[PDB]
Design a protein around this ligand. Structure first.
Ligand SMILES: CCCCCCCCCCCCCCCCCC(=O)O[C@@H](COC(=O)CCCCCCCCCCCCCCC)COP(=O)(O)OC[C@H](O)CO
Ligand SMILES: CCCCCCCCCCCCCCCC(=O)OC[C@H](COP(=O)(O)OCCN)OC(=O)CCCCCCCCCCCCCCC
Ligand SMILES: CCCCCCCCCCCCCCCC(=O)OC[C@H](COP(=O)(O)OCCN)OC(=O)CCCCCCCCCCCCCCC
Ligand SMILES: CCCCCCCCCCCCCCCC(=O)OC[C@H](COP(=O)(O)OCCN)OC(=O)CCCCCCCCCCCCCCC
Ligand SMILES: CCCCCCCCCCCCCCCC(=O)OC[C@H](COP(=O)(O)OCCN)OC(=O)CCCCCCCCCCCCCCC
Ligand SMILES: CCCCCCCCCCCCCCCC(=O)OC[C@H](COP(=O)(O)OCCN)OC(=O)CCCCCCCCCCCCCCC
Ligand SMILES: CCCCCCCCCCCCCCCC(=O)OC[C@H](COP(=O)(O)OCCN)OC(=O)CCCCCCCCCCCCCCC
Ligand code: HEM
Ligand code: HEM
Ligand code: HEM
Ligand code: HEM
Ligand code: HEM
Ligand SMILES: COc1c(O)c(C)c(C/C=C(\C)CC/C=C(\C)CC/C=C(/C)CC/C=C(\C)CC/C=C(\C)CCC=C(C)C)c(O)c1OC
Ligand SMILES: COc1c(O)c(C)c(C/C=C(\C)CC/C=C(\C)CC/C=C(\C)CC/C=C(\C)CC/C=C(/C)CCC=C(C)C)c(O)c1OC
Ligand code: FES
Lengths: 126, 51, 51, 93, 42, 143, 385, 126, 385
């Protein structure tokens, strides 16, 4: 259970610096494509947990096409893992295919939750 | 303790049965406290006629 | 046969006293908090004749 | 959670009893009352009335069976007393 | 008579105080009851 | 197989499967007294029957008994009464020297037995069991 | 969904203890059943303490019982509580059955509950006998041998089954050890089946003394019935204290207090007071196997008791002949117990047989016919046109 | 459980038989008014068990007025029995006010269910 | 609705056993839990059958198992199955905990399950240690003394509680009687909390190896997962039978088959294999109460894991190096146990502190930094601006 906004802040701090980005972006890409989830054909915006209320508020606002594709990918992943195999080298997702689609909903919903939490317990403002 | 080693010397000398353990005879019979008193008091020195 | 008669009777006296007090206490409290339910009254007014 | 079996009574809001209207209740707090307002009147008059009401169904079987038991006891006592050598032989045949 | 005409309850009503009189009595008795129950349990 | 193994583990073991033997002397038993000896989990009667009691034992009408059993079958010595202390009636040994028949008095019941131990009245349609024993001279081995 | 009802662990207690819609017409007879359950669990816990401080070997069984009697602090109290708790347990079981039978609670809504209770009784009389066996006195093992000889009446086989059950032709360590173990174990089956009994009860609800529907009004059990249970158990505990302290060994019989010696039986041998009517029903019928099966029929007749009462009106409060005959029945039951207490001679056997006959005739005949007469009288009297 | 049609048959058998009815009707009404339910303000139809499905079917056809009166009578009976009291001879049901308002529905439902279950399991024998 | 779902007992059986929407990606690891439950049940059954012919006397305890071996039919089977089943229960329990840890089963919807499981773990630490103390062998008395004197360091109360445990001022008949009583009873508490565990799980459901929602495809428990449970339990029964019948002296230690006599004893005294991980850690920090408090810490670290890591992606299957550090930890656990098996000496004594430090450090400092690093690496990899 870790907030997404802190991760976004760290990413914004590290990417804009030229030397850090040019030294740590390719290593990040090779870590992420050696992770194993791209191998099975799953977009990265599906592996995270779906039990905290932030996720429930997030994908409740997700468009129909994204939800349908997510359901198809989830059931295909379940069947493939049950089958003890991998998909052929034609129906995977490339680097450009793994576009982040679940980010803005998380950002907005978690910002709303944070302002709720930090405004409910406000002080008298001495 | 008791004069008998465990039980043997009892049945040999009683000229009959065994002496019941008195540690529980108070509740071993119906009646109770007065039962033993009546049993040890009410017997005459001579049996009823014809017996 | 029973080497606890004095202690048994003392503990029993204490127990009967405490249970009698508790029983009377429970009587009072049961008659107390059931007073609001043992006295509620019902009045039946026939409804207007229209289903 | 699947629904349970069909039963006449359930939980609050769905007792299952007939829908009713026109019933009005009138409660009042136990604090604004005397908790033992009528204990003596109850325990005397109502207790005696209930005893009188139930005094027509309980004592008759007890009395008849008491008579049966007592008659059996008298028969047993009379049999083994100055009759065991002439009467008890003609009953065990 | 309508619902507003409340039936009489004078048979069990008490002195028109409706204050800490009954409340303190009941609370003190239940406190004593807890005392006795705790002593017995201990 | 598992249930059978568990049951056989629960059932009687080796040491209980060994029967005990005891010898009782008949010289010291009084004529008018009853001696009861325990054998291998259950008691055994040893009574010195009077000569009059032998006649009563052997002169019992068969029609009054649900199980036909004579005196000579249940014991070899007419004078000595040697019977196991069990009551097929319920299982509790009748009280000695009591009863309307002059024999035994079953305590759980109040039913009266004869001097020969046969069943007279009750829900017992079966006579008491008969054990087996042998003579050895001045003593009898109940076993 | 507050915290009390949202949390599953607290929700289970909420549906049972915190909130349960019992009717508002409950007499002082159902808290008697709750008292039955509580005295049962008290018996279980004191049994656990005994098993903690008890030895079952023949060389030490009587030694263990007298050591827990004498050579331990608060020891004799445990034995006295066991005896009085067993006696009160059977008394309250009889009261529970009488309340169930009189108020017509065996009817269609809770037939399953009725059979569950019946089988509870069928096996708890067994476990009571088994606990009676564990004493190993001059009459406990005596009655145990009696019951083994009774069970030996199975047709077509007489020796193998009795030898397997009774651990051979003799009695040794395995027999008494297994008897103690099974008296320890069966009450756990009692607890499980009582859990089933409460589940069925909670599913089907509770009946009323009026013998009418109770869904019209209901009240929560907590804060209204918990204190009624508290006061009735305080009364029960006061009575139990009176019988455990002032006169402890009165309900039991003065026969168990003899060291292990199955040589000479005592003059007075009688079963415990909660078994006399069944000893009578055995003694009446002049057959061994038929006597056993008629005892079992007397025990199990409660199973066939439902779908035999064709009285349209539930209960017996508003019917006079039925309750008169019910009182005749209960007094016949107590008379059967009393006659079983005494010995078997003329003329007790004749009236005992008559009592058993009217018992079975009652169950199998009289309630149907008198209930039919009650229904037809109900119909005819009201209609005058 | 006992069919109401048999009760009606026995009732009509008794009611038109002169001597037996003359013998059995005064004891009948004396038993009815010594039963005790009259004092509690109960009509007879409120007492017969209402659990098995046929009784529920009969109840569901009652006009609302009768159901309301029945509910009030049950509630008042519960309240009166809770205090072990009895209201004086003002709420007592009069002698001729204990008319069966629920018998015809019971008889109709009995007949319908009986002929339904009879013709359901039927043979084509002549 | 079918009658199978109508009857309350049958409805509960169907909804809790026959029908259960389990996930479709279940491996043998999840059937391992049901296998462990069956092992627990068979352990209770065989223990009950063992105690029926058992004597609780101090001098008739070792003699009791000797009599079981040499006199009763198939006596060796019961005790061998008991011991090997206990050892296998503990090994499979470690496997179950490891499977729960690696697959991220400790997330928010299963914190209650984690708590009840760790409570079962806490009690299971001693429920078999005291059972081993019961046998009174040649290190059993030593284990009993260790467990009874670990608590003596509490300030202002050091003698009263140990006196209560001792049943006096030393080790005597009360000690062994209490040991046997509690070793018998507290597995029933295990049964209570495992019923609670299964209740919570059935309320919330199982998890997936993938770490994503499993509410898409499900199959009923009966005829689909019953076969998997059946094959797993068949394999377990096969291996357990082969060990118990062919190699009895493999799981247990040949130290307890000697009567208790503190006169002559070898120096090869070491607790059973499953104690070693929580035994080597106790010998690192050199104080008396420090050992107890660090046992408390080592059993609470399993509890602090929820809301400690910062892995938004459930599980470790799809993380590049976190599984590597988990493997480091499991091998450190094994090596810590093995080095605790060896006696204290240089450098093993020096190895103790570093092994304990790594064992705690993975729990405390490794998981949050590694989770945050993994999350930021995912975020930088996925996006380009
Ligand atoms: C010579 C004996 C002396 C005994 C002294 C100790 C007991 C004192 C009891 C209280 C003082 C006596 C008052 C007069 C009798 C009161 C009886 C009665 O009915 O009063 C209440 C009784 O209070 C109870 O709740 C009693 C519970 C009875 C439990 C089951 C019956 C057991 C036997 C009870 C009498 C004997 C008690 C002691 C036995 C050793 C009202 O009943 P209730 O609260 O259930 O309300 C019902 C309704 O409103 C009627 O008004
Ligand atoms: C399940 C929880 C209880 C529910 C209610 C059931 C009540 C009975 C349950 C206990 C079984 C009987 C034990 C009696 C022991 C005893 O009486 O001992 C005697 C003690 C003496 O203490 P002492 O210091 O003077 O001597 C100590 C050294 N012997 O006095 C009492 O105890 C008074 C009796 C109290 C009865 C319980 C109080 C009501 C329940 C409170 C909890 C709710
Ligand atoms: C300080 C004591 C606090 C006690 C908890 C409390 O008093 O309350 C905290 C909450 C009550 O939440 P609630 O019912 O008030 O929420 C009301 C509106 N929803 O109970 C609990 O967590 C119960 C679980 C407690 C777990 C630890 C218990 C340890 C016992 C030793
Ligand atoms: C009843 C409470 C126990 C009274 C008692 O146990 O009273 C003793 C009598 C017999 O006592 P007894 O005549 O054998 O003399 C021996 C004692 N001095 O038991 C019975 O008849 C019990 C059977 C009838 C009562 C229970 C029937 C309903 C349940
Ligand atoms: C208090 C501390 C308690 C410590 C408990 C220690 C328990 C020791 C065992 C731990 C590992 C077993 C549980 C996780 C299993 C698992 O994760 O299996 C899942 C993983 C992979 O899954 P995958 O999906 O990536 O397969 C890929 C397709 N997606 O395969 C394995 O691991 C295989 C086993 C590797 C070796 C295990 C090392 C431990 C062996 C046992 C101990 C040996 C010494 C004795
Ligand atoms: C039954 C008695 C135990 C109930 C425990 C319980 O009920 O614990 C319920 C709560 C969970 O609350 P939850 O189910 O709503 O979490 C649902 C969403 N996950 O866990 C706890 O408090 C655990 C607190 C830590 C352990 C303290 C144990 C205190 C016991 C007293
Ligand atoms: C497989 C069974 C392992 C237990 C065992 O094998 O227990 C026996 C060995 C003992 O080895 P030992 O040389 O001391 O035996 C000396 C006498 N020949 O325990 C161990 O090695 C425990 C080390 C591994 C612990 C792993 C714990 C997590 C899994
Ligand atoms: C000194 C005084 C004695 C006292 C107070 C005493 C007391 C008793 C008591 C209470 C009983 C059992 C009574 C009952 O049935 O409850 C008994 C029985 C018996 N006593 Fe004594 N006794 C005494 C002397 C003796 C003596 C001297 C002997 C011979 C050595 C003896 C031998 C027996 C026997 C054999 C029995 C059992 C009788 C039987 O089994 O039929 N007693 N005694
Ligand atoms: C509701 C259940 C039970 C009933 C009705 C019951 C009944 C009895 C009875 C009548 C006795 C005879 C004791 C006497 O006459 O003094 C007895 C003895 C005994 N019971 Fe139970 N029992 C029950 C449960 C248990 C349990 C759970 C245990 C657990 C170990 C147990 C252990 C014992 C022991 C050890 C004895 C012998 C001790 C003695 O003789 O003082 N009982 N029981
Ligand atoms: C022996 C252990 C038993 C326990 C703990 C127990 C418990 C209960 C409880 C809690 C109730 C709800 C009403 C009340 O509290 O009394 C009840 C009701 C009932 N029980 Fe039992 N019971 C037991 C045995 C039996 C037996 C043997 C029968 C067999 C005749 C039986 C038949 C009934 C019936 C017919 C009811 C219906 C009462 C109502 O209408 O709710 N019970 N029982
Ligand atoms: C399920 C939890 C249990 C575990 C882990 C367990 C463990 C053990 C172990 C390890 C031993 C032998 C010590 C050794 O060889 O290392 C043992 C012995 C024994 N256990 Fe258990 N046991 C459990 C439950 C039970 C239960 C429920 C009983 C019920 C009667 C029982 C009765 C016995 C008996 C009679 C022995 C013989 C030696 C002794 O007295 O300790 N055990 N147990
Ligand atoms: C040793 C006694 C235990 C028993 C009998 C037991 C029983 C079970 C059972 C039957 C399951 C269902 C497995 C499945 O979903 O297919 C399960 C799952 C689980 N248990 Fe236990 N358990 C025990 C101990 C523990 C412990 C100590 C923990 C850790 C604190 C734990 C944590 C879990 C978790 C997290 C799951 C869910 C697994 C999953 O969904 O992937 N259990 N347990
Ligand atoms: C009909 O309306 C109801 C109703 O609906 C309900 C639910 C109840 C409630 C039901 C009951 C109270 C009866 C239920 C009976 C039980 C639950 C029996 C419990 C059985 C047990 C064996 C209890 C289990 C407890 C243990 C195993 C723990 C005991 C062990 C201990 C204390 C170990 C001691 C050792 C040490 C070292 C401390 C009613 O009473 C009631 O009537 C008003
Ligand atoms: C949620 O999905 C499930 C799921 O539904 C189930 C069922 C299981 C399986 C769970 C189990 C098998 C655990 C259940 C175990 C118990 C409830 C233990 C309860 C058993 C006992 C307490 C003991 C059993 C008692 C007996 C067998 C009584 C008989 C014993 C004796 C000694 C009497 C016999 C003696 C004679 C002389 C006849 C799962 O693992 C699971 O997750 C996948
Ligand atoms: S037991 Fe034999 S006559 Fe009664």
């Amino acid at each position: 259970p870790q907030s997404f906004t802190s991760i976004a802040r760290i990413g914004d701090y590290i990417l804009k610096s030229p030397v850090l980005s040019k030294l740590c972006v390719p290593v990040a890409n090779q870590f992420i494509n050696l992770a194993g989830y791209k191998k099975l054909g799953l977009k990265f915006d599906d592996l995270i947990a779906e039990e905290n209320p932030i996720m429930q508020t997030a994908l409740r606002r997700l468009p129909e096409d994204e939800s349908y594709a997510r359901a198809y990918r989830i059931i295909r992943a379940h069947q493939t893992e049950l089958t003890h195999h991998l998909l052929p080298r034609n129906e995977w997702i490339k680097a450009q295919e793994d576009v982040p689609y679940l980010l803005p909903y998380i950002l907005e919903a978690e910002a709303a939750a944070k302002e709720k939490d930090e405004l409910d317990n406000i002080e008298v403002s001495k | 303790p008791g004069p008998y080693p465990n039980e043997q010397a009892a049945r040999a000398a009683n000229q009959g049965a065994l002496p019941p353990d008195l540690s529980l005879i108070v509740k071993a019979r119906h009646g109770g406290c007065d039962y033993i008193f009546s049993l040890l008091t009410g017997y005459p020195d001579e049996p009823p006629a014809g017996v | 046969a029973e080497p606890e008669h004095d202690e048994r009777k003392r503990l029993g006296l204490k127990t009967v006293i405490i249970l009698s007090s508790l029983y009377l206490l429970s009587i009072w409290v049961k008659k107390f908090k059931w007073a609001g339910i043992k006295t509620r009254k019902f009045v039946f007014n026939p409804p207007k004749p229209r289903k | 959670g699947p629904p349970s079996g069909k039963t006449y009574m359930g939980w609050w809001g769905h007792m299952g009893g007939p829908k009713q209207k026109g019933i009005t209740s009138y409660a009042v707090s136990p604090y604004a009352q005397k908790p033992l307002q009528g204990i003596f009147h109850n325990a005397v008059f109502n207790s005696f009335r209930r005893f009188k009401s139930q005094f027509l169904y309980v004592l008759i079987p007890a009395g008849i069976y008491w008579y049966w038991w007592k008659n059996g006891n008298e028969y047993n006592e009379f049999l083994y007393s100055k009759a065991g050598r002439e009467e008890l032989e003609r009953v065990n045949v | 008579k309508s619902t507003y005409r409340t039936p009489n309850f004078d048979d069990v009503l008490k002195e028109n105080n409706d204050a800490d009189k009954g409340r303190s009595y009941a609370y003190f008795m239940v406190g004593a009851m807890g005392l006795l129950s705790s002593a017995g349990a201990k | 197989s598992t249930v059978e193994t568990f049951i056989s583990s629960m059932t009687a073991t080796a040491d209980v499967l060994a029967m005990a033997k005891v010898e009782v002397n008949l010289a010291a038993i009084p004529l008018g007294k009853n001696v009861v000896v325990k054998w291998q989990g259950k008691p055994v009667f040893i009574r010195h029957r009077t000569p009059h009691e032998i006649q009563e034992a052997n002169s019992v009408d068969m029609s009054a008994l649900k199980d036909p059993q004579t005196d000579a079958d249940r014991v070899k010595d007419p004078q000595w009464l040697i019977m196991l202390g069990i009551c097929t009636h319920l299982g509790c040994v009748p009280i000695g020297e009591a009863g309307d028949f002059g024999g035994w008095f079953c305590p759980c019941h109040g039913s009266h037995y004869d001097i020969s131990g046969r069943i007279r009245k009750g829900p017992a349609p079966l006579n008491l069991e008969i054990p087996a024993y042998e003579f050895d001279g001045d003593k009898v081995i109940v076993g | 969904m507050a915290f009390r009802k949202s949390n599953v662990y607290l929700s289970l207690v909420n549906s049972y203890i915190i909130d349960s819609p019992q009717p508002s017409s409950i007499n002082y007879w159902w808290n008697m059943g709750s008292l039955l359950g509580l005295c049962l669990v008290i018996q279980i816990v004191t049994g656990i303490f005994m098993a903690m401080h008890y030895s079952s070997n023949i060389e030490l069984a009587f030694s263990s019982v007298e050591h827990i009697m004498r050579d331990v602090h608060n020891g004799y109290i445990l034995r006295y509580l066991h005896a009085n708790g067993a006696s009160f347990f059977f008394m309250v079981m009889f009261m529970h059955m009488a309340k169930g039978l009189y108020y017509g609670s065996y009817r269609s809504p809770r037939v399953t509950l009725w059979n569950v209770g019946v089988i509870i009784f069928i096996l708890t009389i067994a476990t009571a006998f088994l606990g009676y066996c564990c004493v190993y006195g001059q009459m406990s093992h005596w009655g145990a041998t009696v019951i083994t000889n009774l069970f030996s009446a199975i047709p077509f086989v007489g020796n193998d089954i009795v030898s397997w059950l009774w651990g051979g032709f003799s009695v040794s360590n395995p027999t008494i050890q297994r008897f103690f173990a099974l008296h320890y174990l069966v009450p756990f089956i009692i607890a499980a089946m009582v859990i089933m009994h409460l589940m069925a009860l909670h599913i089907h609800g509770s009946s009323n003394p009026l013998g009418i529907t109770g869904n019209l009004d209901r009240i929560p059990m907590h804060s209204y019935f918990i204190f009624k249970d508290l006061v009735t158990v305080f009364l029960f505990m006061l009575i139990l204290a009176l019988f455990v302290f002032y006169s402890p060994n009165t309900l039991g019989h003065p026969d168990n207090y003899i060291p292990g010696n199955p040589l000479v039986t005592p003059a007075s041998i009688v079963p415990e007071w909660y078994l006399l009517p069944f000893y009578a029903i055995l003694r009446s019928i002049p057959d061994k196997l038929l006597g056993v099966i008629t005892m079992f029929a007397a025990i199990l007749v409660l199973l066939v008791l439902p779908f035999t009462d064709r009285s349209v009106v539930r209960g017996n409060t508003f019917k006079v002949l039925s309750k008169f005959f019910f009182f005749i029945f209960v007094f016949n039951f107590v008379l059967l117990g009393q006659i079983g207490a005494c010995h078997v001679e003329v003329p007790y056997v004749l009236m005992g047989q008559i009592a058993t006959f009217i018992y079975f005739a009652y169950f199998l005949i009289i309630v149907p016919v008198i209930s039919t007469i009650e229904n037809v009288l109900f119909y005819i009297g009201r209609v005058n046109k």
